[PDB]
């Protein structure tokens, strides 16, 4: 047959690493340093669970600026990956305040990733004294978790687009949610 052509979008506040998650995913580098997107398209051919697959991959800007454009990219639309940072409670909280109502309202019965990103910055000695001294504490994954059961998605999954770990999982369980397993 053909490879399975799968549309993803990637949603998420600005700054949570949207952007360095699909280059650091479908060319293994990360990205010089920070600026935000305008909506990008990359793409990967992959295998998973021995189906080929065409995976379209539909960056978008979290910035409340782009709330008017957003809903361009999700026609058609076969997953969304809904992305928020470890290190940012607030992004976390936006994704029952905002995220999780958009996808759901422009992309109805269609399945969703929870991403945690930047699991790099949780395992930061630095990074947590300095959240501690402004009275912030990481998301774990019992929290994330639970976020993702509220919603609804099928996966929530843990990465870090700048060491790589659980990178490859993201994507590989996005195109599982679509995809129809064997009897
Ligand atoms: N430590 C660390 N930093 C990361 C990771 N991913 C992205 N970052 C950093 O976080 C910042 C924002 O990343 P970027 O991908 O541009 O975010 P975005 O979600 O695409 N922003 P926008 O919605 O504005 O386009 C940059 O400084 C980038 O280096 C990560 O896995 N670990
Ligand atoms: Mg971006």
Same mark, same amino acid.
């Given at each position: 047959g053909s490879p399975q052509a799968i549309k993803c979008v990637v949603v998420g506040?600005?700054?949570?690493?949207?952007?360095?998650?699909?280059? /650091?995913?479908?060319?293994?580098?990360?990205?010089?340093?920070?600026?935000?997107?305008?909506?990008?398209?990359?793409?990967?051919?992959?295998?998973?669970?021995?189906?080929?697959?065409?995976?379209?991959?539909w960056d978008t800007a979290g910035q409340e600026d782009y709330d008017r454009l957003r809903p361009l990219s999700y026609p058609q639309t076969?997953?969304?990956?809904?992305?928020?940072?470890?290190? /940012?409670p607030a992004s976390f909280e936006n994704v029952r305040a905002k995220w999780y109502p958009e996808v759901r309202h422009h992309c109805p019965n269609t399945p969703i990733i929870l991403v945690g990103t930047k699991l790099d910055l949780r395992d930061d000695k630095d990074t947590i004294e300095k959240l501690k001294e402004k009275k912030l504490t990481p998301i774990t994954y019992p929290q994330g978790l639970a976020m993702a059961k509220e919603i609804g998605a099928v996966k929530y999954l843990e990465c870090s687009a700048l060491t790589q770990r659980g990178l490859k999982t993201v994507f590989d369980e996005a195109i599982r949610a679509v995809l129809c397993p064997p009897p």
């Open positions: 506040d600005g700054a949570v690493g949207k952007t360095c998650l699909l280059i /650091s995913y479908t060319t293994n580098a990360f990205p010089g340093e920070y600026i935000p997107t305008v909506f990008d398209n990359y793409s990967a051919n992959v295998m998973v669970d021995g189906k080929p697959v065409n995976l379209g991959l076969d997953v969304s990956l809904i992305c928020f940072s470890l290190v /940012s």
